[PDB]
Design an enzyme around this catalytic site. Structure first.
Site, PDB file in Angstrom:
ATOM      1  N   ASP B  35      39.424  49.876  75.448  1.00 12.77           N
ATOM      2  CA  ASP B  35      40.478  49.230  74.999  1.00 12.77           C
ATOM      3  C   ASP B  35      40.408  47.587  74.865  1.00 12.77           C
ATOM      4  O   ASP B  35      40.265  47.097  76.013  1.00 12.77           O
ATOM      5  CB  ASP B  35      41.669  49.643  75.904  1.00 12.77           C
ATOM      6  CG  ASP B  35      42.831  49.117  75.724  1.00 12.77           C
ATOM      7  OD1 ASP B  35      43.059  48.666  74.525  1.00 12.77           O
ATOM      8  OD2 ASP B  35      44.022  48.863  76.588  1.00 12.77           O
ATOM      9  N   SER B 199      44.818  34.879  61.382  1.00 18.18           N
ATOM     10  CA  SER B 199      44.465  35.598  59.901  1.00 18.18           C
ATOM     11  C   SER B 199      45.427  34.715  58.849  1.00 18.18           C
ATOM     12  O   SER B 199      46.140  34.057  59.059  1.00 18.18           O
ATOM     13  CB  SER B 199      44.701  37.080  59.732  1.00 18.18           C
ATOM     14  OG  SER B 199      45.342  37.272  58.587  1.00 18.18           O
TER      15      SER B 199
END
Lengths: 6, 330
Positions: B35, B199
């Site tokens: 994770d 991004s």
């Protein structure tokens, strides 16, 4: 059956 | 010192991925959900409440000759899932793919949520975010990657998730075999303790790319792609029938429809998620409404690049002081 780990 | 282990989806929806890890001496093999958005190595165990374990493999610390109580040490974790887990803590030898780490903190569940009990394929979690997030008290522990880093050839793991298929987690090296073209590395902010990056924009299908900064986290522990309301709205606007449901709690589309691809920007590079990854099938058995894999971030407060986005790339988590995040096409 999604997962969202904090 | 390197390590490679096969990761395998737990369902045909690819809701999560499980990797075998070896704990204890001699070894107990547990399948854990790697994770990158948490920081705790936790496992079902001999101490877990028997009304909360349903076919999962438990770690029995009493059969490990390497296992030792961390006296006074204690953990409690809470996810965005609403998922909960807590208990006490052991040290033990942990091996992933032949990469061995001794005195890893292994946090043994006395207590686990419904969500975990119900999930028979998951034997616990291996957290791969930054150690700042780790939960153990009063002395805070390090993550398996942090424990391995100095031993590794390169302080780095890559993620190569499969669509409907196994893939690989590698530690200590970059398999130049496994991607196409060039790796584009981008800056990571560690400040919240996430693989947190920014991004450079997005395109919907064969549309125009919109240059917009989207901040969010690389999280292999989240199934879906979670993007701002604005961007997610643009995507579904392209699918006839798609709407946000109150009832089911997110965008659904008619199963007979055709998902356009989704492009995200990493630097001057672009990664296309095929529309097929965006299909999460009928919201209910029999149903002809189908669950979308791109959903709004509005109610979580963080944008998450989850398995839907990562499965389309070869991802390097460079954990090198100046950590970076690399994307390649595969």
């Amino acid at each position: 059956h999604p997962f969202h780990x904090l | 010192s390197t390590g490679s282990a096969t990761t395998t989806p737990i369902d045909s929806l690819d809701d999560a991925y499980i990797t075998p890890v070896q704990i204890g001496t001699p070894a107990q093999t547990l399948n854990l959900d790697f994770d990158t958005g948490s920081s705790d190595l936790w496992v079902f165990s001999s101490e877990t409440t028997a009304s909360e374990v349903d076919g999962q493999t438990i770690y029995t610390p009493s059969k490990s000759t390497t296992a030792k109580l961390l006296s006074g040490a204690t953990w409690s974790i809470s996810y965005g899932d609403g998922s909960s887990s807590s208990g006490d803590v052991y040290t033990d030898t942990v091996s992933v793919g032949g990469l061995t780490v001794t005195g890893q903190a292994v946090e043994s569940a006395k207590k686990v949520s419904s969500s975990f009990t119900e999930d028979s394929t998951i034997d616990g979690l291996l957290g791969l975010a930054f150690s700042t997030l780790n939960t153990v008290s009063p002395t805070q522990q390090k993550t398996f990657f942090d424990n391995a880093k100095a031993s590794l050839d390169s302080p780095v793991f890559t993620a190569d998730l499969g669509y409907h298929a196994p893939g690989t987690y590698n530690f200590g090296f970059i398999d130049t075999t496994a991607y196409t073209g060039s790796i584009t590395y981008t800056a990571v902010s560690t400040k919240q303790g996430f693989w947190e990056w920014t991004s450079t924009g997005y395109a919907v299908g064969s549309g125009t790319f919109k240059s917009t900064s989207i901040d969010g986290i690389a999280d292999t522990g989240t199934t879906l792609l979670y993007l701002p309301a604005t961007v997610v709205s643009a995507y579904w606007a392209q699918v006839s029938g798609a709407k946000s449901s109150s009832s089911v709690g997110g965008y659904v589309f008619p199963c007979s429809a055709t998902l356009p691809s989704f492009t995200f920007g990493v630097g001057s590079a672009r990664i296309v998620i095929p529309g097929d990854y965006i299909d999460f099938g009928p919201i209910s058995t029999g149903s002809s409404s189908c669950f979308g894999g791109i959903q709004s971030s509005a109610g979580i407060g963080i944008n998450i690049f989850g398995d839907v986005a990562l499965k389309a790339a070869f991802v390097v988590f460079n954990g090198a002081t100046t950590p970076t995040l690399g994307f390649a096409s595969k």
